Design a protein around this nucleic acid. Structure first.
Ligand code: MG
Ligand code: ZN
Ligand code: ZN
Lengths: 69, 102, 1159
RNA sequence: AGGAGAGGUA
DNA sequence: GGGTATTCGCCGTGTACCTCTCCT
DNA sequence: ACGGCGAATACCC
């Protein structure tokens, strides 16, 4: 609860349950891309908060783009 | 104090042992399940019931995943429900799964 | 669909039991004496049940995986994995049939009902004490007639042969195997057409409900008598060794041996043509052995083992508090889990906990193995596992980076509601206790005199996100049972904030003029100005108001030094009028309320932390203590008590001349003492509250700064009676029965009680302590029942379109308001328009009432509105968001997927331990108990009359017969009053007697609305007397589960007045609206259940068998061959898949959008 | 490994 | 024949945790 | 031990 607020994301998503579903899809796609093991052990963040933050900034993803069918 | 990550399990039900003298494991009782239900935590409640206690095939895969940094989850059925349906048919009753085409 | 969709429960034919098995067990041999190898055809054989070691046969000829599907020839054993011993059964070929004890003694008996003979007569034929004529033959006899084995020779010189009769279980099996079900339906439906439903047209009704059940499924009735027995796999009744050459064997092997050793005995007795007088004694012994194997205690006495303790059967490993359902399927001890003692740790942020290094290193151990083997410290996991046990230096920083943004949940001992689990962010401490933020303690109900806590680790990203988004302690700001906050400062945060914001009249630095918070700070830190001195301060800040606009607060206000020192923590949006008062507990909760409603979530969790720090700091700097002179004893006490004594002496002076009997030694002396107790408790607050100064001719009373007074008036800790006993007088005490001990304790704890006064106060103390522990069972039972009746209620859609509800008003006592219409209509949406008395409307139907719309209800003189209740929702198997209303914990409208049932059940139950004198009343309400001698209502209208022959059956003459003829007659006892006078015109629902109010005589005579009104005001008048506050939308989502079955009136496809679940009546009465035209749809009447009957009458057998009465439920489910669509909350945890609520709904919904987008 | 009895904590 | 009026059996009675000895 | 519920049977309308 340092610098990612759940109130910041409840302006984009619904129900506080949709937030969990969408954030988990985003996080799973981040983690199934590498994101570690090579050079950034203590130089990055957790995919959970990285995915939860891109929703609170209208960043790399919005709810409609989060699919990647 | 007593923490535990993975120890050794029972024989009949295949859940963890309990009591800090063997290696313990805390009882996530039923009142503690009503609370996860009142939050709507479905993913937290599905793994505290299968991959953490007695999904025999799921424990090994969860441990092998964490140590290797992967993601995969099948929750086949808790091995203590196979124990119950196997002793309800040790009476004269037939409890079984089905596919509902009608 | 790739996995089962239902679970069905049948009856097992002998032909299908022999298909489960893999061989017959014949000898009661478990294991070899000296070597540890199974016998040949015993309870543990390896040709039957499977190999003992993985991928090798018993003798050792094929020990490999290279031989997958080989069966050996030296031994009949198979080369396969040894897990199959958990799954693979065999059987026992009985030579005598034996009944199944469940289908005989489960009350009712599905066997004494097929034949229509009382079980007292079936038990004689089944345990060899009488005969039955399987066939009377051409002989004149009857069929199901009991021939005494002596009277079996009735005319053996004239009856002889050419008819059949026997005894045992083959008698009953032959009576079942040849019994014409269609024909008994024929001549039984001809016996129920009579409509003579007095005494026989109820006992004949159940028999055909049973006989049509067998025609429907396919189960022959002769399968209730076993001709073959199955034996459990061996790895489920295990033979683990013991310390020192022993075996802690099971009781399922004892009871299997006690059956094989009578089967074999009776078999080779049959071979020899041994006499019948002993072969029958054997057969009766084979039957009781099987009845004990299935469950001992039903019929036998106590069939008992070595340690004089009765053996545990198969029907005990699935039932009761220690069976399989509870204790193993709603249970499950878990990994990645720990425990410790909790300490206070007051420098934490509300979202944090202190976690020892020693615990956190165990709990997070595979994460650490991976992060070692990742960042080039160990190559294979063995060296990493090795450096974790030596506790190197490179390990304690990896552990700090691994648990960084990885939350954990903490739980306390009884999880009474859902705030008993919250997620936190761990920070490694050193020590062995857990640090718990001071503000999350009233949620958990914890303090720090010994309590412990458990820590669980979420493992998956969908559970790590669920921990942050839903459970994390920063989201749980308000109660789900009310709207009130749960992070309100409590005890010595309240005392610091109360202390610095009081004010002293003539103080040092009084009247100064400051322009900032930096000014008052700098001037205070110099020791030159008081903290209670009145000052003037200049403010300039923005303040949001009710509508949402933002005006500007300016000027120069009159403050105190201490209040203005709090101005630094107030956020922008809140007015300084909040802090500019004395800050008792109530006002701090109001500050937090406003901060949440006007500013939101993180603003409130920052304001709370800052108030915590300020209170902790300024209670210290104050040096506030308690001595023995704070307990100031009034100066009138001795004279007050002496006058009470002289009055007591005069009362007994009266009594000695026989002028009064019970008053002159009771109810008068006790009133003298009860009045003096409170006069002295009044004098004691005029001494601990007031003060005195007279410096500049200043002789007057000022509010005291006494430390005992300031602790109570702060609302921090302490009452007026607790303070009355320390420095007033303790007054009257109670003997446990309840009466008052005539001699009052005229001493307080400060001067000290004597020994004859300290004795009489131990009765009450022991009575209280005894109540306290013999009551949590009463409340835990009620809570568990409520969670089983209301569990599967979930909000599943936004609107149902209904337009019906309930009339809400103020719940007056008949003397005064006691609760306003506002605070009762907040959060509830409107079902009808709210037109005013002049004619114009204010609010349309369908408006979610909130705080900005309920003033219109009170400012415009409205006093009865029609709110969309959940007793009246039109949704099937769920609720809608617009009939529920507000969330009560988010201060919004509910979301789709929000489990209102559990939330509703553990908000009536959690305060259970706080009300007992009470809890029996809410039990007798939620259980719909038809009370003793309740009343008698009025079924029909007309005029009133009467008539009786003094036969204690006073009839009714409600037939007015003035408009024609009428048939309106009743009966009653002759020793009771009929509330209707000798004449009246009483319509449906009038009372022709007086007494309690039956909740079933309100549901058919007055409809659903009077019943809802009754139970709703009744359940709340019991919680409000103890000051407990539950929203009445929680009692209404439980009454909805008491009205869910109806008694039929018409018929389209079902029987008559037989009950039925509404969601069944409603779906067919909607096919007929399509199928034929309206096809006389079906008309029905709602009836009322209890919370236990409603939960046992469920349409799920898996969910009712988990609850209680497991055998009474499983026998019926197997005879009716019921099917369980999983469909529910509890049904879905037994088989381990996502519950249909919360995130389990939303993943289905949000995935329905993908297959659409790929099309 | 499991169960009994007895005590104790919250 | 119908309708009570006892009479008798069945099912239920909070959560988590620690220690000891004794039996198998 | 206590309570509440339900099937069983005997004693009067
Ligand atoms: Mg405590
Ligand atoms: Zn072999
Ligand atoms: Zn509705």
């Amino acid at each position: 609860m340092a610098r990612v607020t759940v109130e910041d994301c409840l302006d984009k998503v619904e129900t506080r349950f949709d937030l969990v579903v969408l954030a988990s899809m985003r996080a799973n796609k981040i983690l199934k891309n590498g994101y570690s093991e090579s050079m950034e052990n203590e130089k990055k963040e957790k995919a959970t908060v990285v995915a939860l933050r891109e929703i609170a900034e209208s960043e790399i993803t919005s709810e409609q783009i989060l699919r990647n069918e | 104090m007593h923490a535990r990550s993975t120890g050794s399990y029972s024989l009949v039900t295949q859940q963890p042992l309990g009591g800090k003298a063997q290696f313990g494991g805390q009882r996530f009782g039923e009142m503690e399940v009503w609370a996860l239900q009142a939050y709507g935590a479905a993913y937290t409640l599905r793994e505290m019931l299968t991959v953490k206690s007695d999904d025999i095939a799921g424990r090994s895969k969860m441990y092998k995943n964490i140590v290797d940094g992967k993601l995969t989850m099948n929750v086949d059925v808790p091995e203590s429900f196979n124990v119950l349906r196997n002793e309800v048919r040790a009476l004269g009753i037939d409890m079984d799964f089905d596919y509902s085409s009608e | 669909s790739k996995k089962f969709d239902i679970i069905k429960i049948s009856l097992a034919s002998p032909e299908v039991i022999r298909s489960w098995s893999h061989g017959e067990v014949k000898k009661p041999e478990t294991i070899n004496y000296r070597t540890f190898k199974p016998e040949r055809d015993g309870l543990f054989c390896a040709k039957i049940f499977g190999p003992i070691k993985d991928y090798e046969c018993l003798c050792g000829k094929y020990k490999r995986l290279k031989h997958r599907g080989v069966v050996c020839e030296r031994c009949g054993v198979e080369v396969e994995q040894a897990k199959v011993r958990r799954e693979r059964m065999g059987h026992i070929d009985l030579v005598c049939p034996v009944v199944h004890i469940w289908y005989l003694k489960s009350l009712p008996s599905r066997i004494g009902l097929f034949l229509d003979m009382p079980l007292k007569n079936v038990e004689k034929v089944l345990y060899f004490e009488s005969y039955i004529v399987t066939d009377p033959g051409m002989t004149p006899l009857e069929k199901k007639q009991l021939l005494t084995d002596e009277e079996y020779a009735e005319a053996l010189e004239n009856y002889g042969y050419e008819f059949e009769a026997s005894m045992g279980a083959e008698a009953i099996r032959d009576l079942l195997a040849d019994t014409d079900i269609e024909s008994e339906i024929e001549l039984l439906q001809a016996e129920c057409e009579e409509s003579k439903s007095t005494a026989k047209k109820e006992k004949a009704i159940k028999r055909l409900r049973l006989l049509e059940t067998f025609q429907a499924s396919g189960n022959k009735p002769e399968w209730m008598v076993m001709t073959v027995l199955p034996v459990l796999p061996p790895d489920l009744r295990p033979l683990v060794p013991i310390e020192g050459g022993r075996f802690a064997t099971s009781d399922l092997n004892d009871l299997y041996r006690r059956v094989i050793n009578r089967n074999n005995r009776l078999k080779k007795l049959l071979d020899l043509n041994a006499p019948d007088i002993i072969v029958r004694n054997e057969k009766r012994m084979l039957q009781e052995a099987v009845d004990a194997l299935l469950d001992n205690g039903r019929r036998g006495r106590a069939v008992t083992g070595s340690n004089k303790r009765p053996l545990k059967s198969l029907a005990d490993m699935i039932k009761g508090k220690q069976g399989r359902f509870r204790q193993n399927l709603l249970g499950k001890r878990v990994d990645y889990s720990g425990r410790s003692v909790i300490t206070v740790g007051p420098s934490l942020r509300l979202h944090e906990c202190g976690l020892p290094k020693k615990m956190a290193l165990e709990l997070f151990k595979p994460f650490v193995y991976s992060k070692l083997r990742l960042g080039g410290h160990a190559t294979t996991i063995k060296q990493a596992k090795r450096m974790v046990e030596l506790e190197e230096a490179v390990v304690w920083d990896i552990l700090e980076t691994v648990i960084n943004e990885h939350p954990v949940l903490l739980n306390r001992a009884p999880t009474l509601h859902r705030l008993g689990i919250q997620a936190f962010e761990p920070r490694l401490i050193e020590g062995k206790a857990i640090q718990l933020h001071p503000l999350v303690c009233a949620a958990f109900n914890a303090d720090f005199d010994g309590d412990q806590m458990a820590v669980h680790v979420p493992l998956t990203v969908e559970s790590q996100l669920e921990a942050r988004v839903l459970m994390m302690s920063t989201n749980n700001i308000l109660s789900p049972a009310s709207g009130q906050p749960i992070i309100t400062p409590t005890q010595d945060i309240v005392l610091g904030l109360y202390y610095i914001t009081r004010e002293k009249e003539g103080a040092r630095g009084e009247g100064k003029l400051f322009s900032s918070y930096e000014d008052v700070s700098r001037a205070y830190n110099s020791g030159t100005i008081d903290i209670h001195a009145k000052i003037k301060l200049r403010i300039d800040r923005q303040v949001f108001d009710t509508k949402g606009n933002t005006y500007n607060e300016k000027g120069v206000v009159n403050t105190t030094v201490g209040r203005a020192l709090l101005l630094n923590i107030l956020p922008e949006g809140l007015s300084f009028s909040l802090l500019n008062k004395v800050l008792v507990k109530k006002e701090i909760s109001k500050i937090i309320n406003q901060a949440f409603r006007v500013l939101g979530g993180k603003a409130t969790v920052v304001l709370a932390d800052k108030l915590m720090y300020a209170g902790f700091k300024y209670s210290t700097l104050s040096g506030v203590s308690v001595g023995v002179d704070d307990m100031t004893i009034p100066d009138n006490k001795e004279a007050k008590i002496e006058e009470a004594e002289k009055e007591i002496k005069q009362i007994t002076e009266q009594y000695q001349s026989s002028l009064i009997t019970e008053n002159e030694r009771y109810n008068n002396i006790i009133n003298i003492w009860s009045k003096t107790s409170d006069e002295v408790g009044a004098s004691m607050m005029d001494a601990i509250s007031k003060d005195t100064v007279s410096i500049n001719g200043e002789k007057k009373e000022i509010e005291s700064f006494n430390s005992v007074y300031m602790m109570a008036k702060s609302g921090a800790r302490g009452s007026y009676n607790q303070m009355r006993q320390l420095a007033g007088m303790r007054g009257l005490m109670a003997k446990p029965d309840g009466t008052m001990i005539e001699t009052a304790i005229t001493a307080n704890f400060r001067e000290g009680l004597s020994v004859l006064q300290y004795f009489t106060s131990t009765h009450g103390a022991r009575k209280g302590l005894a109540d306290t522990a013999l009551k949590t069972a009463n409340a835990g039972y009620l809570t568990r029942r409520l969670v089983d009746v209301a569990q599967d209620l979930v909000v599943i859609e936004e609107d149902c379109g209904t337009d019906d509800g309930l009339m809400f008003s103020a719940i007056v006592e008949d003397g005064e308001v006691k609760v306003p219409l506002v605070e009762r209509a907040l959060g509830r949406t409107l079902a009808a328009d709210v037109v005013t008395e002049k004619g114009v409307v204010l609010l349309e139907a369908g408006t979610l009432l909130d705080e900005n719309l309920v003033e219109l209800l009170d400012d415009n003189g409205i006093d009865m509105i029609k709110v969309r209740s959940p007793i009246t929702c039109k949704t099937r198997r769920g609720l809608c968001a617009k009939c529920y209303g507000r969330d009560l914990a988010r201060e919004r409208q509910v979301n789709v997927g929000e489990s209102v049932g559990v939330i509703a059940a553990q908000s009536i139950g959690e305060p259970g331990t706080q009300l007992t004198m009470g809890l029996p009343r809410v039990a007798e309400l939620f259980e719909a108990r038809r009370p003793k001698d309740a009343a008698i209502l009025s079924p029909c209208d007309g005029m009133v009359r009467l008539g009786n022959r003094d036969t204690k059956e006073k009839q009714r003459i409600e037939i007015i017969d003035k408009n024609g003829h009428i048939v309106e007659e009743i009966l009653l006892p002759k020793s009771r009053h009929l509330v209707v006078f000798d004449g009246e015109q009483v319509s449906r629902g009038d009372v022709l007697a007086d007494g309690p109010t039956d909740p079933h005589d309100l549901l058919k005579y007055k409809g659903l609305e009077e019943f809802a009104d009754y139970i709703l005001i009744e359940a709340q008048s019991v919680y409000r007397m103890q000051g407990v506050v539950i929203n009445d939308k929680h009692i209404e989502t439980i009454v909805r589960q008491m009205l869910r079955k109806a008694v039929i009136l018409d018929e389209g496809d079902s029987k008559f007045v037989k009950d039925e679940s509404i969601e069944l009546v409603r779906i067919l009465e909607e096919n007929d609206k399509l199928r034929k035209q309206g096809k006389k749809e079906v008309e029905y009447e709602l009836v009322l259940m209890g919370i236990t009957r409603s939960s046992l009458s469920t349409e799920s057998f898996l969910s009712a068998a988990s609850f209680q009465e497991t055998t009474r439920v499983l026998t019926e489910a197997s005879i009716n061959s019921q099917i369980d669509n999983l469909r529910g909350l509890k049904e879905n945890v037994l088989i381990g898949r996502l519950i249909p609520a919360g995130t389990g709904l939303a993943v289905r919904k949000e995935s329905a959008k993908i297959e659409k987008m790929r099309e």
